[PDB]
């Protein structure tokens, strides 16, 4: 072992290599594995698809402004339109997978900032109006980032999610969000963040279009900054890889 700060990951067809990174946080202490034949209840045979599904699908990018609050994604839904993971997701009826989340954000030695890369299992949300429940087009984007705000929510539109960043939108203390697995991105000494998450859920296999497994949240606790005479555009990107996929219950598409 020489020069700890360099990693390398070759999963299937893609490879992501960082030179300046921290350690790798591996789930709750387990590596994602297939489903044993002692805990299954499906009566069909599964379908370990290919290397063609365990790949590195990169999602959209965004700009880290100087007033931005935070973004998030829904994991089983963000990869709905990507390659052969989005075809075996809708043609079948069941499935279980694990992911390998990644994040890139690189700045010079004259910038500053921080971020909290964390994934929350079973993330709920709260509508703006108390009586109603949130919409769907205001809860999940089509692999495009959803963003928090500074003002709380207003009183509209009776279905919008409440983007109150200091409460996280779930109704908890934002400082206590370090229980779920995570990693910090400090531009002083960091350039990325890796996270390996297994499949955590009550039932053995669950639908993909009806119930979202996890939720990826990004929150900058310390805003960007820089003196005059430097690049004012700092973008962010994320790369995710389905790990150990399986399916059951073949039907027509939807």
């Amino acid at each position: 072992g020489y020069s700890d700060r360099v990693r390398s990951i070759t999963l299937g067809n893609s490879t992501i290599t960082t030179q300046e990174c921290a350690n790798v946080v591996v789930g709750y202490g387990v590596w994602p594995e297939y489903l044993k034949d002692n805990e299954a209840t499906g009566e069909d045979q599964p379908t370990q698809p290919d290397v063609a599904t365990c790949r590195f699908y990169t999602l959209e990018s965004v700009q880290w402004m100087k007033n931005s609050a935070g973004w998030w994604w829904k994991l089983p839904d963000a990869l709905s339109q990507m390659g052969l993971f989005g075809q075996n997701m809708q043609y079948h009826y069941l499935g279980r997978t694990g992911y390998t989340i990644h994040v890139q954000c690189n700045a010079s030695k004259f910038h500053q900032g921080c971020l909290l890369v964390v994934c929350v299992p079973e993330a709920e949300m709260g509508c703006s109006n108390l009586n109603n429940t949130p919409k769907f087009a205001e809860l999940s984007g089509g692999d495009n980032a959803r963003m928090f705000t500074d003002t709380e929510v207003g009183t509209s539109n009776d279905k919008k999610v409440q983007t109150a960043v200091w409460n996280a939108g779930m109704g908890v203390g934002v400082g206590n969000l370090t229980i779920f697995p995570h990693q910090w991105i400090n531009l002083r000494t960091n350039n990325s963040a890796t996270i390996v998450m297994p499949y955590i859920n009550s039932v053995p296999m669950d639908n993909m279009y009806r119930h979202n497994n996890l939720t990826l949240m990004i929150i900058p606790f310390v805003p960007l900054n820089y003196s005059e005479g430097s690049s004012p555009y700092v973008p962010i990107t994320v790369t995710i890889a389905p790990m150990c996929a399986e399916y059951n219950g073949l039907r027509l598409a939807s």
Binding site: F56, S61, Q63, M82, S108, F110, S231, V234
Partner: protein, 178 residues
């Protein structure tokens, strides 16, 4: 930009709207207008067939305060020139970030029905494409020039071969040089 050394460096910027493309070209050693002249393109023109892999190396040559990530995709031919970044991310790719041994090597594997291929441009035995997209912007502190270039190397792997020796069409003579 062909009668100078500016035809060797890819220009990289620092821009607002992400997902900008940096470069791209089809994959055809000895056939395309980019690889038909390099060290592998001048040896591959003496033959007619070939089969193997290719190692493409890069080298970010910006200042030591520069930063950024990049994507490198190779989409086999069923439908080429992916317009968006999300169209290219489905194929084979890799994610490279700069700084402290910046140079990264993408390995174009060998994926073809037949065993060999034609150096000439043959529509039956096409190869694929190659592209690179902005995974994250180029951020820089103040008092640093933002325009930074990159050099792109190319080489052959160890499962490579050739066949059917022929004569190259580059050199052409008109009369005996007195």
């Amino acid at each position: 930009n062909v009668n100078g050394l500016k035809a060797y460096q890819i220009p990289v910027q620092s821009n607002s709207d992400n997902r900008r493309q940096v470069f791209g070209f089809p994959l055809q050693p000895g056939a395309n207008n980019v690889l038909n002249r390099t060290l592998l393109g001048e040896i591959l023109n003496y033959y007619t067939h070939w089969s193997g892999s290719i190692k493409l190396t890069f080298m970010f040559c910006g200042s030591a305060m520069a930063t950024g990530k990049f994507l490198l995709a190779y989409s086999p031919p069923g439908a080429g020139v992916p317009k968006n970044r999300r169209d290219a991310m489905l194929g084979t790719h890799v994610i490279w970030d700069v700084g402290l041994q910046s140079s990264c090597v993408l390995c174009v594997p060998w994926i073809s029905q037949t065993h060999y291929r034609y150096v000439v441009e043959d529509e039956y035995t096409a190869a694929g494409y190659v592209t690179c997209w902005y995974q994250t912007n180029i951020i820089v502190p103040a008092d640093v020039q933002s325009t930074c270039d990159i050099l792109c190397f190319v080489s052959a792997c160890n499962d490579f071969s050739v066949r059917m020796l022929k004569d190259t069409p580059f050199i052409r003579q008109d009369n005996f040089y007195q």
